[PDB]
């Protein structure tokens, strides 16, 4: 070991498995041990670890999955798609704090919210995994962004965690001291989300029709799907089935007749 050279192109010090403890400064390094390496050797890397950002560890290059990227994913264009990667790092930190409060949870009879946190967690991790790829359509991108933001802020709200802003594009632009009043209105937008979902906890988590009313107040077109299975009738001849929506109060049909032909054998023709 010698010849160390400072660089920042090694932010993503990625292990492979629990590292051997060969170094006096290394251990069974965890899988997620993304370490801020300060000094780089060809076969080895010593620098700050996520677990202890004040303590070094010399770590094999073969063990490091080298990644030139940094916390910024656009300067080196590491983005799978721009305006999304900040979201993944923030949600990773968010899952970290989820784990911490989780630790704090089991030791307490907060089990109800604990399991609802479990299912929040499963939803969020699967969304994370599915957005690991950039395959989604831009509408899917935006919808994922919005809903995961809603869920993470929900986790924040019942847990008494602070709020974030800048709904889109990483939730970072607004906290970047761009303005003052836009900061305000963003904060109240978030508080509106808070109030929406807290009042609707007792609406959806208990009942199931207020959610339908709220969702249907947003869209106008709907389609009734009908899947015919079998006609049970004693006719013995060719039969035409004109099934359509009807208004008994208005004494008229509401949808066009869907002609279904039924054979004389008991089977549709």
């Amino acid at each position: 070991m010698a010849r160390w050279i400072p660089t920042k192109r090694q932010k993503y010090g990625v292990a492979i498995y629990n590292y051997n403890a060969s170094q006096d400064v290394e251990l069974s390094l965890q899988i997620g041990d993304t370490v801020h390496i300060l000094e780089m050797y060809e076969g080895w890397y010593r620098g700050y670890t996520l677990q202890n950002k004040s303590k070094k560890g010399i770590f094999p290059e073969t063990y490091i999955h080298l990644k030139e990227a940094t916390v910024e994913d656009l300067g080196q264009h590491e983005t799978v798609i721009p305006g999304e990667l900040p979201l993944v790092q923030e949600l990773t930190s968010t899952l970290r704090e989820w784990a911490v409060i989780w630790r704090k949870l089991y030791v307490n009879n907060k089990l109800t919210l604990f399991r609802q946190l479990q299912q929040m967690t499963y939803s969020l991790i699967e969304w994370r995994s599915q957005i690991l790829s950039g395959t989604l359509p831009k509408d899917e991108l935006a919808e994922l962004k919005k809903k995961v933001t809603a869920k993470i802020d929900h986790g924040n709200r019942m847990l008494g965690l602070d709020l974030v802003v800048r709904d889109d594009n990483g939730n970072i632009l607004d906290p970047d001291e761009t303005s003052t009043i836009a900061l305000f209105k963003a904060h109240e937008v978030a508080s509106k989300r808070i109030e929406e979902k807290i009042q609707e906890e007792k609406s959806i988590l208990q009942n199931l029709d207020l959610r339908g009313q709220s969702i249907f107040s947003t869209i106008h077109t709907y389609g009734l799907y009908v899947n015919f299975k079998n006609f049970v009738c004693n006719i013995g001849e060719d039969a035409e089935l004109f099934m359509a929506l009807y208004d008994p109060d208005q004494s008229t049909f509401i949808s066009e007749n869907y002609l279904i032909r039924w054979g004389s054998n008991g089977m549709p023709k």
Binding site: V14, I31, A99, Y106, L132
Partner: protein, 198 residues
């Protein structure tokens, strides 16, 4: 997932000790426990609280309290933790083998647990149902410092261990772990770091 499983179960103890300290908290907060044959105006409910020092047990013939534990000097605030031989669970309970007026029916077969102490005194107690019964047994073996006997405890073990390992595999995304560990590059024996330390 062979290296994955090896690494996973190999960093075990933290989850175990977390479970055990949770059991400790549960014992301390405790509840009103169930006596034997509390029919003829006998308090079936009575609290058994562990000390915050977890060295004495606050229990006794307490009243039918639906609120649960009341913090005070129970009828006996000491259970000698340092000398408990064991707790008998099931048929090992001598009170279950009773064939007189203290006949415990077969429906409390899994609520029979008696603390062994004084080599002749026993505490034939009853749990309201299985999960807390296993919880109290787990808490006792935690005082005993051995393995657990709650199915829910194994549940917690597997689920939380899975959660933790799952939240570690984020760095190794789009990456593979050679089941054979990667070969160690030869570290030059010289420690004369050309660059400074820290």
């Amino acid at each position: 997932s062979r290296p994955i499983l090896e690494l996973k179960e190999k960093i075990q103890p933290e989850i175990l000790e977390l479970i055990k300290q949770q059991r400790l908290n549960r014992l301390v907060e405790g509840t009103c426990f169930r006596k034997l044959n509390a029919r003829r105006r006998q308090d079936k409910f009575w609290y058994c609280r562990l000390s915050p020092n977890h060295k004495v047990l606050h229990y006794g013939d307490l009243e039918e309290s639906p609120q649960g534990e009341v913090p005070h000097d129970s009828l006996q605030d000491k259970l000698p933790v340092a000398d408990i031989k064991a707790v008998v669970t099931g048929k090992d309970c001598p009170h279950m083998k009773e064939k007189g007026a203290l006949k415990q029916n077969k429906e409390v077969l899994e609520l029979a647990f008696s603390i062994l102490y004084d080599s002749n005194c026993q505490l034939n107690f009853i749990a309201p149902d299985k999960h807390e019964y296993c919880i109290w047994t787990d808490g006792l073996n935690a005082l005993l410092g051995k393995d657990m006997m709650s199915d829910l405890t194994r549940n917690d073990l597997d689920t939380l261990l899975s959660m933790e390992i799952k939240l570690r595999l984020l760095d190794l995304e789009n990456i593979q772990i050679p089941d054979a560990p990667p070969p160690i590059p030869k570290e030059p024996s010289n420690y004369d770091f050309v660059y400074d330390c820290n």
